[PDB]
Design an enzyme around this catalytic site. Structure first.
Site, short mmCIF file in Angstrom:
data_model
loop_
_atom_site.label_atom_id
_atom_site.label_comp_id
_atom_site.label_asym_id
_atom_site.label_seq_id
_atom_site.Cartn_x
_atom_site.Cartn_y
_atom_site.Cartn_z
CB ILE A 27 15.70 13.41 11.33
CG1 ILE A 27 14.73 14.04 12.33
CG2 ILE A 27 15.08 12.20 10.65
CD1 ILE A 27 13.55 14.73 11.68
N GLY A 30 21.25 17.89 19.17
CA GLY A 30 21.44 19.18 19.81
C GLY A 30 21.71 19.06 21.29
CB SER A 31 22.83 21.60 23.76
OG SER A 31 21.93 22.59 23.29
N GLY A 33 18.88 17.48 23.19
CA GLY A 33 18.61 16.06 23.08
C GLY A 33 18.63 15.55 21.65
CB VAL A 34 17.51 12.79 20.15
CG1 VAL A 34 17.75 12.07 18.84
CG2 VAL A 34 18.61 12.46 21.15
CG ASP A 146 18.41 29.81 16.92
OD1 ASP A 146 19.43 30.40 16.53
OD2 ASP A 146 18.33 28.56 16.99
C1 LIG Z 1 11.94 20.52 15.21
C2 LIG Z 1 11.80 20.65 13.69
N1 LIG Z 1 12.59 19.60 13.01
C3 LIG Z 1 12.22 19.13 11.75
C4 LIG Z 1 13.15 18.51 10.93
C5 LIG Z 1 12.75 18.06 9.68
C6 LIG Z 1 11.43 18.23 9.28
N2 LIG Z 1 10.51 18.86 10.13
C7 LIG Z 1 10.91 19.30 11.34
N3 LIG Z 1 10.00 19.93 12.19
C8 LIG Z 1 10.44 20.59 13.35
O1 LIG Z 1 9.60 21.13 14.07
#
Ligand SMILES: C[C@H]1Nc2cccnc2NC1=O
Ligand SMILES: [Cl-]
Length: 348
Positions: A27, A30-31, A33-34, A146
């Site tokens: 889903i 990024g730099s 990984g995945v 960020d």
């Molecule tokens: C890392 C970040 N990614 C994420 C994408 C979609 C739904 N929940 C998420 N939770 C996260 O911590």
């Protein structure tokens, strides 16, 4: 397919247990990984797994930080484990995190494309929880670096907001230098663009102000062509920074040669429908002088969020608001006296 790993709880004691999950799909990217989505076999609960390549020699800064955090407005680290990847010598760290699909970014985009405005009630809810999460992490001297709409996960039903993605976060140490080209461009503080390396966690506050403005406007407030044009976009609203303001930002270089531009009054920046409290709060977020900006705790105390402290306040879907006043001593450390304002009578 059912996968089993030996994973250590995030906030718990350092004792590995077997964890099983299935329904694994990519889903994110990024730099680093995945990112996968999976379902735990035990609770059938959904989770995100962030997979990062690990330099077995050095410690993972994001892991360290994630293990310290325990907050309702921060995505919590459920577990972490290691795995193999490509070469026989490569080791991957895996972060098992809360799964929250919706984001402030997607939500704000729906409104922007429908030529609609996000109702101020949500702006208050979202921004307040963001400021609260920042107050929490800042009390540890940890800066996120960020803050952006994409990193604000939403539970659409409860309007609970959670800060995520600590891959850029760091514990700032007075004296020790930090990289300047950091943060997503639109949300990058002016001192960073000035190449500052001795900056503070107030850069997150700038970023937060950028999010607020964006939510009020329906589009980014400083949409820069580049890291340097980012400063031009900024200047076109706040006007050219004074020589003292520039000095305050601790510049590594000021040889920009920017043309002289006068400030554009805030009341003029937003739709006329915009509440003064929102404008007023914004103007004390987006200040050149880093120390002039509100702290997250003060921001939480701002009048813009008064409605949230009203005993009768309710979510538009009729439900009660998430818990907004259950502050901890840790959270109030930067200015305890603010409890008088932050924790209202009915809440005690
Ligand atoms: C890392 C970040 N990614 C994420 C994408 C979609 C739904 N929940 C998420 N939770 C996260 O911590
Ligand atoms: Cl709602």
């Amino acid at each position: 397919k059912v996968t089993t790993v030996v994973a250590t709880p995030g906030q718990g004691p350092d004792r590995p247990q077997e964890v099983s999950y299935t329904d694994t799909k990519v889903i994110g990217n990024g730099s680093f990984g995945v990112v996968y989505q999976a379902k735990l076999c035990d609770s059938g609960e959904l989770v995100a797994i962030k997979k990062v390549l690990q330099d077995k020699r050095f410690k993972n800064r994001e892991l360290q930080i994630m293990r310290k955090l325990d907050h309702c407005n921060i995505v919590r680290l459920r577990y972490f484990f290691y795995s193999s990847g490509e070469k026989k010598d490569e080791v991957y760290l895996n972060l098992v995190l809360d799964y929250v699909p919706e984001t402030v970014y997607r939500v704000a985009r729906h409104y922007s494309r429908a030529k609609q405005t996000l109702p101020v009630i949500y702006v208050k809810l979202y921004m307040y929880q963001l400021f609260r999460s920042l107050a929490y992490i800042h009390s540890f001297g940890i800066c996120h670096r960020d803050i952006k709409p994409q990193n604000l996960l939403l539970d659409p039903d409860t309007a609970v907001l959670k800060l995520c993605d600590f891959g850029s976060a760091k514990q700032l140490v007075r004296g020790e230098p930090n990289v300047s080209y950091i943060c997503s461009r639109y949300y990058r503080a002016p001192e960073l663009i000035f190449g500052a390396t001795d900056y503070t966690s107030s850069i997150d506050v700038w970023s937060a102000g950028c999010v607020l403005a964006e939510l009020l406007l329906g589009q980014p407030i400083f949409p820069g062509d580049s890291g340097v044009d980012q400063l031009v976009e900024i200047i076109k609203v706040l006007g050219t920074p004074t020589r003292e303001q520039i000095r305050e930002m601790n510049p590594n270089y000021t040889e920009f040669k920017f043309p002289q531009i006068k400030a554009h009054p805030w009341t003029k920046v937003f739709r006329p429908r915009t509440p003064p409290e929102a404008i007023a709060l914004c103007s004390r977020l987006l200040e050149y002088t880093p120390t002039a900006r509100l702290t997250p705790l003060e921001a939480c105390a701002h009048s813009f969020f008064d409605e949230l402290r009203d005993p009768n306040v309710k979510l538009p879907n009729g439900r009660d608001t998430p818990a907004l006043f259950n502050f901890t001593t840790q959270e109030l450390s930067s200015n305890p006296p603010l409890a008088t304002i932050l924790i209202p009578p009915h809440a005690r």
